[PDB]
Design a protein around this nucleic acid. Sequence first.
DNA 1: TTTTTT
Lengths: 213, 213
Amino acid sequence: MKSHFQYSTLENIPKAFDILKDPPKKLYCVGDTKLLDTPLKVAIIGTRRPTPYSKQHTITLARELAKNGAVIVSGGALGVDIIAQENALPKTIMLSPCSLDFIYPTNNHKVIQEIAQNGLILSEYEKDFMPIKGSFLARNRLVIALSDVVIIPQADLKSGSMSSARLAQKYQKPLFVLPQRLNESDGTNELLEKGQAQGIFNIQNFINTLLKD
Amino acid sequence: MKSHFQYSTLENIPKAFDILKDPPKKLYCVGDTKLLDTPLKVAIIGTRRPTPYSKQHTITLARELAKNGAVIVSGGALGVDIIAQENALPKTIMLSPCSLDFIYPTNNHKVIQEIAQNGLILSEYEKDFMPIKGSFLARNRLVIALSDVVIIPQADLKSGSMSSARLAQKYQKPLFVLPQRLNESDGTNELLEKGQAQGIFNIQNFINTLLKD
DNA sequence: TTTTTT
């Protein structure tokens, strides 16, 4: 799917990426580049197939965080990503797994279009670059590096979310997950079990605690 | 409701009770007093209105602990209590909020009879004593005192279960809970949020670990 | 909750 986006490049690579082994040398952008100056950047990422429960609270988290002046960072994926990003508009930054001349995934075109229009989309890839396994992983590192705090509402084991979670730990980005029932959201519960993430037991509280930092 | 139980008195107060600031001077009993010598005593207490979710896992916890030679201690209450006790039979000990000549709650009369027959029921009250606000809270301290570990599958804030959690902490009895969604079990989630309880993220590993010590 | 619990 063609985006018909009119895109350029960032003048400067955000310093957040300096922590990376191989920081992007060039970033392509469409939308509000000033969002990159937001004091509080929060990643919300997770399963492409969230339960009604997780969706419900992903919406509250995104809306309230954006209401309090934070910007939500995600990857525009089906499920958790695109729920969080739509509900954070216009304060949201998407890192694309393809060049900005392409829309991916196709079914998210309306929201992604709105992000291009009122938020910000960034890509490491210049043109005619279709999503490929390595680019999904590559952009995942950018979501984590750019973000100050990482929220994973719901996630399975051995998922991309879990890889991103390990990146968050590597870079000491505070990691929070939604409380989840047994034998569901296995990935996030393992994070809780191993003390690698904190649970969000009260959304308004959680947010005020982030703000007071 | 009269029980028509034939009951006696324990020859003396079990040692576990001597931690209490006001230990029972006498305990009345019906059933198999040999259960008091079981190495591992585990309390399973909680809301009188468990979700299907909490119910299914309470059943597994109770059965598997019994299989592993543990005795399940509870108060024979509607909901979590009686589910665990019935599934722990015959290895279960009930602490009654009333004298043993009465059945409470009446809806549990069938299982309570089975506990008197094949398990053990204890009471601090000799006779003609119906349950009262004070006797539930008194009973709770005996559940906590007798038990080595306390599992609270699901509970509301400011509840009898929470009262028991407070006693568990006071008398250095380790707490454990089931993972619960946001706004379904505020009581147990608060325990998790304050690090006052540990979550059960795998029932089989939970049990094995208990056996280790 | 009348059918009982910080």
